[PDB]
From a paper:
Our results provide insights on how DNA architecture scaffolds a substrate and E3 ligase to promote SUMO modification in the context of DNA repair.
A fragment of Siz2 encompassing the PINIT and SP‐RING domains is inactive toward RPA. We queried if this fragment of Siz2 differs in any substantive manner from Siz1 relative to its substrate, E2 or SUMO binding surfaces by obtaining a crystal structure of this fragment at a resolution of 2.65 Å. The Siz2 structure suggests that its PINIT and SP‐RING domain are correctly folded, with the latter appearing competent for E2 and SUMO binding. These observations, combined with our inability to detect activities for this fragment, underscore a role for dsDNA, the SAP domain, and ssDNA in templating a complex to promote RPA binding and modification.
Author numbering: 153 to 322, 330 to 420
Amino acid sequence: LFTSPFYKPIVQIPDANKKLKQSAGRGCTKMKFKVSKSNHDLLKSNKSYKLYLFSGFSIPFIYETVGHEAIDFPYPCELVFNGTKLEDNVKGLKKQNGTGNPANLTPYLKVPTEMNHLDLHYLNIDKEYSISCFIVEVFSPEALLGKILKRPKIIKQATTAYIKRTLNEQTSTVLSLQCPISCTRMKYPAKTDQCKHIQCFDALWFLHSQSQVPTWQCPICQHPIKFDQLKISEFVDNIIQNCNEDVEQVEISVDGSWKPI
Ligand SMILES: [Zn+2]
């Protein structure tokens, strides 16, 4: 589904749809389609435009839209576009559904006058799938970080109020300045207002992780979050800007004050 911030649709490619039906065993599904010269000119008009293949669960017996499906490729799958195998990690996190990525067909496209062949080899198919192709504008983690930075941060007053309201449980708590993902000093300590914890994670490393495994779960509380909920924490940010690189942890009291450990 186009709920991802890394790619957004510009136009659907016609005659590039396909339904994959259940198969007991071995099989291969073929798709022929052409990409008009106008769509080639559009791809050339902007460096951020790519041709992405999408696969989703095809829920039967009801109406479904072209994009609303969460990205789910049949696992295992071998995708071959114009003879060249696609090395894309199309379906990451095999254990979870909806954590797949699209396949980039842009570099292996043929001229408009010729035909594009997409083969999909499989050993079995337990559920029906919908296959689509879209031209999309892609965004890198750095641009998305820029978007996050331009947002209003989580004010330090809110964090101090939360600390004071929490530590009255029945002495001190440890705030890490390190990122759980990168294991390095955070540069962009971020989280969500939905998160019930003062600990943060580096926004850039989070976006880097999600760009290859779209779980969209907080690396700390594992709650499902969304891109537009990410905001910088002014409290941890100020603590970092006023600390030496040596410090990895910090002691926090009910006062909101903080001491290097
Ligand atoms: Zn959280």
